[PDB]
Design an enzyme around this catalytic site. Structure first.
Site, PDB file in Angstrom:
ATOM      1  N   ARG A 154     -10.338  -4.620   3.484  1.00 33.56           N
ATOM      2  CA  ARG A 154     -11.569  -4.121   4.083  1.00 33.56           C
ATOM      3  C   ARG A 154     -12.483  -3.733   2.920  1.00 33.56           C
ATOM      4  O   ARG A 154     -12.011  -3.455   1.811  1.00 33.56           O
ATOM      5  CB  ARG A 154     -11.305  -2.922   5.008  1.00 33.56           C
ATOM      6  CG  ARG A 154     -10.982  -1.615   4.319  1.00 33.56           C
ATOM      7  CD  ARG A 154     -10.745  -0.515   5.349  1.00 33.56           C
ATOM      8  NE  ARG A 154      -9.334  -0.152   5.436  1.00 33.56           N
ATOM      9  CZ  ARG A 154      -8.735   0.771   4.683  1.00 33.56           C
ATOM     10  NH1 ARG A 154      -9.418   1.454   3.771  1.00 33.56           N
ATOM     11  NH2 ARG A 154      -7.436   1.000   4.831  1.00 33.56           N
TER      12      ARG A 154
ATOM     13  N   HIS B 108       2.241   4.459  -2.941  1.00 37.28           N
ATOM     14  CA  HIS B 108       2.422   5.905  -2.799  1.00 37.28           C
ATOM     15  C   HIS B 108       3.817   6.242  -3.301  1.00 37.28           C
ATOM     16  O   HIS B 108       4.065   7.312  -3.862  1.00 37.28           O
ATOM     17  CB  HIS B 108       2.344   6.333  -1.343  1.00 37.28           C
ATOM     18  CG  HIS B 108       0.966   6.316  -0.780  1.00 37.28           C
ATOM     19  ND1 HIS B 108      -0.128   6.864  -1.411  1.00 37.28           N
ATOM     20  CD2 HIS B 108       0.518   5.865   0.417  1.00 37.28           C
ATOM     21  CE1 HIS B 108      -1.174   6.736  -0.590  1.00 37.28           C
ATOM     22  NE2 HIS B 108      -0.827   6.133   0.531  1.00 37.28           N
TER      23      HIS B 108
ATOM     24  N   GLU C  93      -5.100   9.011  -1.481  1.00 37.15           N
ATOM     25  CA  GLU C  93      -5.468   7.833  -0.716  1.00 37.15           C
ATOM     26  C   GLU C  93      -6.430   6.968  -1.524  1.00 37.15           C
ATOM     27  O   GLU C  93      -6.201   5.773  -1.704  1.00 37.15           O
ATOM     28  CB  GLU C  93      -6.118   8.226   0.613  1.00 37.15           C
ATOM     29  CG  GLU C  93      -5.138   8.647   1.704  1.00 37.15           C
ATOM     30  CD  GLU C  93      -4.114   7.567   2.044  1.00 37.15           C
ATOM     31  OE1 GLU C  93      -4.482   6.370   2.055  1.00 37.15           O
ATOM     32  OE2 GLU C  93      -2.946   7.923   2.315  1.00 37.15           O
TER      33      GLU C  93
ATOM     34  N   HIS D 298       0.875  -1.164   0.000  1.00 33.70           N
ATOM     35  CA  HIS D 298       0.000   0.000   0.000  1.00 33.70           C
ATOM     36  C   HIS D 298       0.913   1.214   0.000  1.00 33.70           C
ATOM     37  O   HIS D 298       0.828   2.065  -0.882  1.00 33.70           O
ATOM     38  CB  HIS D 298      -0.863   0.021   1.263  1.00 33.70           C
ATOM     39  CG  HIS D 298      -1.716   1.247   1.402  1.00 33.70           C
ATOM     40  ND1 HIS D 298      -3.007   1.354   0.927  1.00 33.70           N
ATOM     41  CD2 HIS D 298      -1.438   2.446   1.976  1.00 33.70           C
ATOM     42  CE1 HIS D 298      -3.458   2.582   1.223  1.00 33.70           C
ATOM     43  NE2 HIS D 298      -2.540   3.282   1.860  1.00 33.70           N
ATOM     44  N   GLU D 299       1.796   1.286   0.989  1.00 31.36           N
ATOM     45  CA  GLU D 299       2.713   2.408   1.079  1.00 31.36           C
ATOM     46  C   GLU D 299       3.611   2.448  -0.152  1.00 31.36           C
ATOM     47  O   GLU D 299       3.962   3.520  -0.635  1.00 31.36           O
ATOM     48  CB  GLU D 299       3.560   2.331   2.355  1.00 31.36           C
ATOM     49  CG  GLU D 299       2.765   2.449   3.651  1.00 31.36           C
ATOM     50  CD  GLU D 299       1.815   3.645   3.692  1.00 31.36           C
ATOM     51  OE1 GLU D 299       2.263   4.794   3.502  1.00 31.36           O
ATOM     52  OE2 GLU D 299       0.609   3.434   3.926  1.00 31.36           O
TER      53      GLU D 299
END
Ligand code: ZN
Ligand code: ZN
Lengths: 397, 397
Positions: A342, A220, A241, A216-217
């Site tokens: 999620r 970015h 995001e 995820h990071e």
């Protein structure tokens, strides 16, 4: 393919995969920390992210989702633990074809040697936005100072042990903040990361796979390297995001903004094509300027004019843009990884939980993470289920 | 790039882009219909899909979501209208880099010349599962019968004007149905499609872009060509639908099934690698068997053994598998197209609506569809909004 080096935190410096570096923000300050090249263009520094903090910040001020602990990552033991956990995580990311793809894209997205405010006809490595200093050890015995370029530098968490984050190097030009990672040039990206404290969700609860938290990071990091890090475009969260999460949440960003962003990056790239078209020299002689013209041309997917001028090709740019903003998202990576995600980005993220033994192959391995099929934990992501994999996690407070 | 031929329904036959074909199911029956090569390997036949129907089926039996009208696509006028609307739609799909990618993948996924029940060492074109007969016109004046291979054949709707669908050619071998498009070999794919009647959604209501409806069906076509059409794997809907929609709905398919499917396709491919490894000849002499070994090797992403045997390479297979099952979905295509999609696949699909003038550039164009920015209809997908773009649609009944 991609190699993920191995090393114990006690291993000696070798001026190759283990050195003493002065982080980008400590430039000229002569403050060095041991770091490790987990793989080309990516370093790991087992130290808390302290830049822009004060010790007062590094503990729970009295006044779960904001857990603290100033002693974390302070002893050599903690650090070697941090070091090993990160290696397993990278190996975990590399062993899935979709993980190898992400790292590959990140390793090759080297920051352009220059920015909106550097000599247009000259490649420039003299900036902490593109290079960091290290301590080398001559064969003679002398210890000299030098510098090298890099794409990513990963640190331990800042004051908030459970708040992972990715920031690009900020340049202070003409008394204002400039972000070469939003102009399309890219810049060294820095990460504050904590492999141990993962979030939980329910929209039966589950705890998250730290390796997914890392990718995820990393996404970015990807946006940054290509210089298209969506700024604090809050709307009330930053579009950056949403793009990173993916799925339908990505569509929460209005066409108007998406179009404005696309048009802006396009302009930024047209400008870089023009700039790259005048680089004739480089401050640093140990640089094949012609080799970089080639690498950068592949990076931004340019073409050469009848006369030689680098030019943006709309179609190739669009494929590259989609690739950079849609090609890698938490939802699709979770999908391609047998990992639970999620429901929506706005899905509650309950009190974090701590995974004490990611180094225990019986709890987490570099091919299936928590969802080990031999422990009939692959199915239904039971390895991530809180009622089932009870031993792999401990509560915060 | 990809060329999308043009032609009026009145244009004469030319044995190239406009012929008289005996559809795959009418094989040996000598029943021909005019068809048009919209582009390589893809044909359009302005005729209602009648296979397996009876006139009693072609009208509203007394006993909105199931609209009927047996006169639709019956006159040359209707057909030329159908023909033109489809051309614009394909051009609409081709003009977006993500649309060009899909068509490219579909055009090159040519059905293997054979199946689980054909001579292993011989390429076979003598099957309606891979070839269709047509009527040619010799330069002499004589009209002969011949045959050609194809990937896709698109028809008009069947009895249900608003029920688009994609079926692969079913072979009757040893008194049971066999699907070469589920064994990994692929087969001619047939489409029943109605460009005019699109569904509506709300989870303010919107009507759908017919071009997206086409790509949706095309994705089923893609799965088929690579021979991995998820069967009637109902669970209570077929996994095939979920994969095609995408987003989180794709995760409704349990790891157990996804894994079972993956393992099954892998086996199917290992078997095809072995089979391709023995083809030494071909019934049809007008076929470079060596040229096809090459094309098929790229299709299934195989490698050659030290001795020459074609073999599956796990990693390359996984990239190709992800590409085929995740690389193209309604959610991501809608995304990359400035097109509105319904929230989840299970989102209600209210009474269809009819778009009477897709040929009217003021209502729908081949670059922005309904969301024409010049009509300030690009923003917020207002071109798809029912309260805003009131003139672009008419109610059913
Ligand atoms: Zn984030
Ligand atoms: Zn469908």
């Amino acid at each position: 393919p991609i190699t993920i080096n191995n090393f114990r935190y006690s291993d000696p410096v070798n001026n190759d995969t283990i050195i003493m570096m002065e982080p980008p923000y400590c430039k000229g300050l002569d403050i060095y920390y041991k770091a490790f090249k987990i793989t080309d263009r990516i370093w790991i520094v087992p130290e808390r992210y302290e830049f822009g903090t004060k010790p007062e910040d590094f503990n729970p001020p009295s006044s779960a989702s904001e857990y603290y602990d100033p002693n974390y990552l302070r002893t050599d033991s903690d650090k070697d633990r941090f070091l090993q956990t990160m290696v397993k995580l990278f190996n975990r990311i590399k062993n899935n074809v979709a993980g190898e793809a992400l790292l590959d894209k990140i390793i090759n997205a080297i920051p352009y040697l220059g920015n909106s405010y550097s000599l247009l006809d000259k490649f420039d490595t003299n900036s902490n936005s593109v290079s960091f200093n290290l301590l080398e050890q001559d064969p003679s015995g002398a210890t000299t100072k030098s510098a090298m370029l890099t794409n990513l530098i990963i640190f331990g968490p800042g004051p908030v042990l459970n708040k992972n984050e990715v920031r690009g190097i900020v340049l202070r030009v003409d008394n204002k903040n400039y972000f070469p990672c939003r102009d399309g040039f890219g810049s060294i990206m820095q990460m504050a990361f904590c492999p141990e404290y993962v979030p939980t969700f329910d929209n039966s609860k589950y705890f998250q796979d730290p390796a997914l938290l890392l990718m995820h990071e990393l996404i970015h990091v990807l946006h940054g390297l290509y210089g298209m890090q969506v700024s604090s475009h809050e709307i009330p969260i930053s579009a950056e995001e949403l793009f990173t999460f993916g799925g339908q949440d990505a569509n929460l960003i209005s066409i108007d903004i998406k179009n404005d962003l696309y048009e802006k990056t396009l302009n930024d790239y047209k400008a870089i094509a023009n700039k790259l078209s005048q680089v004739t020299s480089c401050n640093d002689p140990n640089i094949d300027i012609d080799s970089y013209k080639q690498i950068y041309q592949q990076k931004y997917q340019f073409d050469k004019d009848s006369n030689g001028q680098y030019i943006v090709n709309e179609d190739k740019f669009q494929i590259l843009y989609n690739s950079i903003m849609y090609g890698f998202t938490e939802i699709e990576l979770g999908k391609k990884f047998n990992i639970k995600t999620r429901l929506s980005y706005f899905s509650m993220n309950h009190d974090p939980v701590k995974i004490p033994n990611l180094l225990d192959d019986t709890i987490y391995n570099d091919t299936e993470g928590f969802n080990i099929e031999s422990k009939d934990l692959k199915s239904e992501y039971k390895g991530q289920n809180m009622r089932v994999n009870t031993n792999a996690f401990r509560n915060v407070d």
